[PDB]
Design an enzyme around this catalytic site. Structure first.
Site, PDB file in Angstrom:
ATOM      1  N   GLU A   4       0.818  -1.215   0.000  1.00 48.19           N
ATOM      2  CA  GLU A   4       0.000   0.000   0.000  1.00 48.19           C
ATOM      3  C   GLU A   4       0.852   1.267   0.000  1.00 48.19           C
ATOM      4  OE1 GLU A   4      -2.217  -0.782   3.654  1.00 48.19           O
ATOM      5  OE2 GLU A   4      -3.817  -1.776   2.525  1.00 48.19           O
ATOM      6  N   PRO A   5       1.766   1.428  -0.966  1.00 46.66           N
ATOM      7  CA  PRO A   5       2.568   2.663  -0.988  1.00 46.66           C
ATOM      8  C   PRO A   5       1.695   3.874  -1.282  1.00 46.66           C
ATOM      9  CG  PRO A   5       2.808   1.557  -3.080  1.00 46.66           C
ATOM     10  CD  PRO A   5       2.018   0.595  -2.159  1.00 46.66           C
ATOM     11  N   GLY A   6       1.905   4.953  -0.516  1.00 46.58           N
ATOM     12  CA  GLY A   6       1.269   6.221  -0.829  1.00 46.58           C
ATOM     13  C   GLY A   6       2.300   7.252  -1.258  1.00 46.58           C
TER      14      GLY A   6
ATOM     15  N   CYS B  11      -2.539  36.018   7.971  1.00 39.51           N
ATOM     16  CA  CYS B  11      -2.460  37.023   9.024  1.00 39.51           C
ATOM     17  C   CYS B  11      -2.265  36.282  10.346  1.00 39.51           C
ATOM     18  CB  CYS B  11      -3.738  37.847   9.029  1.00 39.51           C
ATOM     19  SG  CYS B  11      -3.817  38.906   7.553  1.00 39.51           S
TER      20      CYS B  11
ATOM     21  N   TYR C 242       0.491  14.269   0.245  1.00 38.91           N
ATOM     22  CA  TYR C 242      -0.188  14.824   1.426  1.00 38.91           C
ATOM     23  C   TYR C 242      -0.267  16.347   1.406  1.00 38.91           C
ATOM     24  CZ  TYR C 242       0.294  10.031   3.102  1.00 38.91           C
ATOM     25  OH  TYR C 242       0.212   8.655   3.230  1.00 38.91           O
TER      26      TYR C 242
HETATM   27  C1  LIG Z   1      -4.819  37.128  14.571  1.00 38.85           C
HETATM   28  N1  LIG Z   1      -3.387  36.949  14.839  1.00 38.85           N
HETATM   29  C2  LIG Z   1      -2.872  35.574  15.003  1.00 38.85           C
HETATM   30  C3  LIG Z   1      -3.902  34.720  15.757  1.00 38.85           C
HETATM   31  C4  LIG Z   1      -3.471  33.282  16.017  1.00 38.85           C
HETATM   32  C5  LIG Z   1      -3.758  32.297  14.907  1.00 38.85           C
HETATM   33  C6  LIG Z   1      -3.538  30.871  15.369  1.00 38.85           C
HETATM   34  N2  LIG Z   1      -3.878  29.877  14.325  1.00 38.85           N
HETATM   35  C7  LIG Z   1      -1.481  35.573  15.668  1.00 38.85           C
HETATM   36  O1  LIG Z   1      -0.655  34.717  15.288  1.00 38.85           O
HETATM   37  O2  LIG Z   1      -1.269  36.440  16.540  1.00 38.85           O
HETATM   38  C8  LIG Z   1      -5.159  38.601  14.545  1.00 38.85           C
HETATM   39  C9  LIG Z   1      -6.085  39.180  15.438  1.00 38.85           C
HETATM   40  C10 LIG Z   1      -6.929  38.327  16.340  1.00 38.85           C
HETATM   41  O3  LIG Z   1      -6.156  37.650  17.324  1.00 38.85           O
HETATM   42  P1  LIG Z   1      -6.885  36.886  18.550  1.00 38.85           P
HETATM   43  O4  LIG Z   1      -5.757  36.181  19.296  1.00 38.85           O
HETATM   44  O5  LIG Z   1      -7.545  37.968  19.386  1.00 38.85           O
HETATM   45  O6  LIG Z   1      -7.882  35.926  17.940  1.00 38.85           O
HETATM   46  C11 LIG Z   1      -6.207  40.566  15.478  1.00 38.85           C
HETATM   47  N3  LIG Z   1      -5.470  41.331  14.663  1.00 38.85           N
HETATM   48  C12 LIG Z   1      -4.637  40.834  13.704  1.00 38.85           C
HETATM   49  C13 LIG Z   1      -3.882  41.773  12.805  1.00 38.85           C
HETATM   50  C14 LIG Z   1      -4.502  39.451  13.593  1.00 38.85           C
HETATM   51  O7  LIG Z   1      -3.788  38.952  12.691  1.00 38.85           O
HETATM   52  C1  LIG Z   2      -0.971   6.043   5.467  1.00 43.38           C
HETATM   53  N1  LIG Z   2       0.016   6.131   6.552  1.00 43.38           N
HETATM   54  C2  LIG Z   2      -0.442   6.717   7.830  1.00 43.38           C
HETATM   55  C3  LIG Z   2      -0.482   8.248   7.740  1.00 43.38           C
HETATM   56  C4  LIG Z   2       0.877   8.889   7.482  1.00 43.38           C
HETATM   57  C5  LIG Z   2       0.949  10.362   7.840  1.00 43.38           C
HETATM   58  C6  LIG Z   2       0.163  11.263   6.911  1.00 43.38           C
HETATM   59  N2  LIG Z   2       0.339  12.695   7.255  1.00 43.38           N
HETATM   60  C7  LIG Z   2       0.404   6.259   9.035  1.00 43.38           C
HETATM   61  O1  LIG Z   2      -0.168   5.584   9.923  1.00 43.38           O
HETATM   62  O2  LIG Z   2       1.611   6.574   9.036  1.00 43.38           O
HETATM   63  C8  LIG Z   2      -1.251   4.617   5.047  1.00 43.38           C
HETATM   64  C9  LIG Z   2      -0.578   4.011   3.961  1.00 43.38           C
HETATM   65  C10 LIG Z   2       0.349   4.801   3.083  1.00 43.38           C
HETATM   66  O3  LIG Z   2       1.533   5.208   3.762  1.00 43.38           O
HETATM   67  P1  LIG Z   2       2.742   5.923   2.976  1.00 43.38           P
HETATM   68  O4  LIG Z   2       3.699   6.357   4.072  1.00 43.38           O
HETATM   69  O5  LIG Z   2       3.339   4.860   2.068  1.00 43.38           O
HETATM   70  O6  LIG Z   2       2.149   7.076   2.203  1.00 43.38           O
HETATM   71  C11 LIG Z   2      -0.811   2.671   3.695  1.00 43.38           C
HETATM   72  N3  LIG Z   2      -1.680   1.975   4.436  1.00 43.38           N
HETATM   73  C12 LIG Z   2      -2.380   2.492   5.476  1.00 43.38           C
HETATM   74  C13 LIG Z   2      -3.299   1.608   6.270  1.00 43.38           C
HETATM   75  C14 LIG Z   2      -2.225   3.839   5.772  1.00 43.38           C
HETATM   76  O7  LIG Z   2      -2.914   4.364   6.673  1.00 43.38           O
END
Ligand SMILES: *[C@@H](N[C@H](CCCCN)C(=O)O)c1c(COP(=O)(O)O)cnc(C)c1O
Ligand SMILES: *[C@@H](N[C@H](CCCCN)C(=O)O)c1c(COP(=O)(O)O)cnc(C)c1O
Ligand SMILES: [Cl-]
Ligand SMILES: [Cl-]
Ligand code: NA
Ligand code: NA
Ligand code: NA
Ligand code: NA
Lengths: 461, 461
Positions: free
Chosen positions: A301-303, A381, A416
């Site tokens: 099952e290569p991916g 952002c 992926y």
């Molecule tokens: C949002 N800034 C991001 C928020 C985190 C994202 C995580 N997946 C950061 O990295 O600081 C942001 C906000 C809102 O931030 P909150 O923490 O209040 O939700 C407000 N202003 C700007 C310019 C932002 O980019």
């Molecule tokens: C997929 N392998 C999974 C998910 C890998 C991480 C993805 N961000 C794991 O358990 O590592 C998988 C494959 C294919 O694997 P490849 O590494 O060759 O792509 C084959 N069989 C099953 C059952 C899987 O889940």
């Protein structure tokens, strides 16, 4: 020495354009299968991924050639790696089968032309609706992951009066601890009673055992040890139960090179170096299986190996700035040259969430020395949306002449990278282009439109 | 002691259903705003998120009440936190404004009914098409993140003959290194010439300076120190340039409690404990601003605080298994009880990618002691798809009576949880339900269908 690091990276750059089966140069630009990637990124809006049907074919050839010592080998591409329909079609046309990981993955494999007998359905949560769809479509294998799920397989196969073909997934304790860290499969100790139950079920056909070691595995020993466990139990159950298994399914995990300068890397410490080849994987698996039977079918099952090397992410340099750290007297402590591309972690998720390295080059200036240390930021952002897996620490190398408008390429971007995209900040998920066997390009996935951003929502207009 | 951990967790459970303004119990089930969540998860297919308009309103009240000492405060919800149209509508109807992080976010805010003068557009990559759309729509603010971007603002505002209203984003060096770690904003040293340049532009109007400290910030000091930098530079530029700024925009970052037992937490070591409240944020900001002017407008951009506490992820226990580690004599070393829910990291991304903790309870058995240590897995075919941020290490607590078919709830699931979903394994992104102010429920986002997912692809058959 950073000079030595810069020298080494430029040696790698030259090897891309002079010693790589995928790439060439023209007009100063990186070419993939003869397609100028700067020119291609002027015809389609960035960021987008471009896949190579020729390179997918080369990868599949490596895998199949690796298994030449075992004629009865069946290869199932793990479609969770990439299930864009045009990519699945290239894989189907290259002559292998498909492994699916949800009801919708089963359906898309059937739609694109894989027959039921070319599909394996794996999962830890296969609900009754999922199992009914799979069984009704005569899949080659449905794995059995738990005793709870097996009760549904028995009940639904009886309701349909249709035989469900199954492989029992066993996860060996091969020295992490399996009970604490492996959610998938049954324990070795449960294999015998599970197989016993299946034999007695009128519409469930036991075809063998299944495992999957992991992803990007940098050593052959885990495949050999785990395969031996499943082989030893297969041989034992044949004797105990008085049966002959059709197959053994040994899963995936063949690594792909994300860093190529193997002389400078230790795959056990940095698994961006591929520790083994497909031939190493095959030798380990086949050797263990043949200690039991030479005639049994081996399913793999290569991916990642099928598509990982077969795509490039093209993203335009869309802004630039210099930030300067000053001391308390106003003297410069350092400058940082930031280059902003129009793809961030919502487009290339593993670069952020899984510390994944991909080679980064200026595709518009591919024959120019990459002689300037820069930091590469995305457009989200979010202060964390910049690429941390650099050439040296968090720093990349691009030509000092790099300009807004240039096209940056991330190599080895084919595994992926599509289904893992998000609409965070309501930036669209990307288009995808395919280079076919003739070297011609076509769009195979559109960029999400605005109408796509809101069509899922229910609101008074 | 784990008995103490179990006792503490069950005290927290009792406080959810007997102390929390959001929740109650009925028929043994967790209720949110009087809605039985077990019953709701029998009406809509799991997994799905349910939002509470009442709790969004309470959060906005906390924010606005915190700023009572400063009348001229304008609050912009950072819509990257959650931009489902029904959620945006609840926020619009609650009376605040909107901050947007892409062209499509600007457009959806306008579509749902935010006026241009209620919208701030921030970003590090604002391409000409993005800027043209924003300027044509008379946005209250477009921030200026770089000198390169500013050239496009000048050229496009001239082309449209429409005034672009701007704030210059300045990121202070507040002590790991701004130049190395902050891609956003200009250096403090660049603010003066940048502002002088803007004053001279015929169609660009300089409103003030902008910053944003970060997300889930567990201390008041970074906000006070950074605001003082912006205030000191604002006061200095008023004198140097002979102007009176309309505003100062101090960004977002008010944290939300993800763990509630503050007596057991150190917010500086584990920022799932909120180290501060909205009142602390406002005291720090207002105190610094008033050292300069009391009449100036203060703009804030809270994201997480508006919606984080206002949703629950409901996911059905869909499979179960026991794995056992045996010693070399066949005796049991330990058992691990795995419970599988139909949501994994493709549905709740930050639980995996950002080590984010959310309270987990059995909503179907909310009045029962959560007395069994379990590991909680998702449905993705990926060994890493299980929830690692447990009550104790990677272990959660659920009633020993937990059965397949029960509904598990993740609390505080309303910030950064919808747009961050993926179709990995081609599992659909989730539906979203809203509990309105009257306590009635409605679907506000559909679950992705099979069609929706394949319709972006361009394929033969
Ligand atoms: C949002 N800034 C991001 C928020 C985190 C994202 C995580 N997946 C950061 O990295 O600081 C942001 C906000 C809102 O931030 P909150 O923490 O209040 O939700 C407000 N202003 C700007 C310019 C932002 O980019
Ligand atoms: C997929 N392998 C999974 C998910 C890998 C991480 C993805 N961000 C794991 O358990 O590592 C998988 C494959 C294919 O694997 P490849 O590494 O060759 O792509 C084959 N069989 C099953 C059952 C899987 O889940
Ligand atoms: Cl095959
Ligand atoms: Cl307001
Ligand atoms: Na472009
Ligand atoms: Na049978
Ligand atoms: Na359900
Ligand atoms: Na001006």
């Amino acid at each position: 020495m950073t000079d030595s690091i810069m020298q080494n990276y430029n040696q790698l750059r030259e090897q891309v354009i002079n010693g790589d089966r995928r790439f060439q140069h023209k007009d100063g630009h990186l070419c993939f299968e003869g397609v100028d990637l700067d020119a291609l990124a002027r015809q389609y809006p960035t960021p987008f991924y471009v896949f190579s049907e020729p390179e997918i074919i080369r990868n599949i050839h490596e895998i199949q050639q690796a298994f030449a010592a075992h004629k009865n080998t069946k290869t199932f591409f793990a479609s969770k790696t990439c299930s864009v329909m045009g990519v699945l079609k290239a894989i189907r046309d290259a002559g292998i089968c498909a492994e699916a990981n949800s009801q919708y993955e089963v359906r898309k494999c059937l739609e694109i032309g894989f027959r039921g007998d070319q599909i394996v359905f794996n999962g830890v949560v296969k609900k009754p609706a999922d199992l009914e769809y799979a069984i009704a479509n005569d899949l080659y294998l449905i794995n059995v992951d738990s005793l709870y799920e097996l009760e549904h397989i028995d009940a639904i196969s009886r309701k349909l009066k249709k035989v469900a073909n199954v492989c029992v997934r066993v996860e060996p304790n091969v020295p992490l601890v399996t009970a604490f860290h492996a959610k998938s499969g049954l324990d070795l100790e449960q294999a015998e009673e599970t197989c016993r139950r299946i034999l007695a079920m009128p519409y469930v056909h036991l075809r063998g055992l299944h495992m999957h070691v992991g992803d990007q595995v940098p050593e052959s020993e885990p495949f050999a040890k785990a395969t031996k466990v499943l082989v030893d139990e297969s041989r034992r159950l044949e004797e105990v139960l008085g049966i002959k298994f059709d197959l053994i399914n040994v899963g995936g995990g063949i690594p792909v090179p994300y860093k190529y300068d193997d002389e400078n890397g230790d795959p056990l410490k940095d698994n961006m170096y591929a520790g083994i080849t497909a031939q190493d994987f095959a030798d380990a698996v086949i050797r263990e299986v043949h200690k039991w039977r030479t005639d049994v079918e081996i399913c793999i099952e290569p991916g990642r190996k099928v598509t990982g090397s077969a795509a490039v992410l093209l993203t335009e340099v869309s802004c630039e700035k210099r930030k300067t750290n000053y001391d308390l007297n106003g003297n410069v402590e350092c400058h940082v040259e930031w280059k902003f591309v129009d793809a961030g972690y919502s487009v290339l998720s593993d670069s952020q969430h899984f510390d994944w390295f991909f080679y980064v080059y200026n595709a518009s200036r591919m024959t120019a020395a990459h002689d300037a240390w820069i930091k590469l930021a995305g457009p989200l952002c979010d202060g964390g949306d910049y690429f941390h897996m650099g050439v040296k620490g968090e720093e990349f190398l691009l030509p000092k002449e790099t300009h807004v408008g240039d096209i940056v390429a991330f190599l080895d971007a084919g595994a992926y990278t599509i289904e893992s995209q998000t609409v965070f900040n309501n930036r669209p998920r990307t288009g995808v282009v395919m280079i076919d066997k003739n070297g011609d390009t076509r769009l195979i996935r559109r960029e999400d439109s605005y109408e796509d951003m809101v069509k899922y929502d229910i609101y008074l207009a």
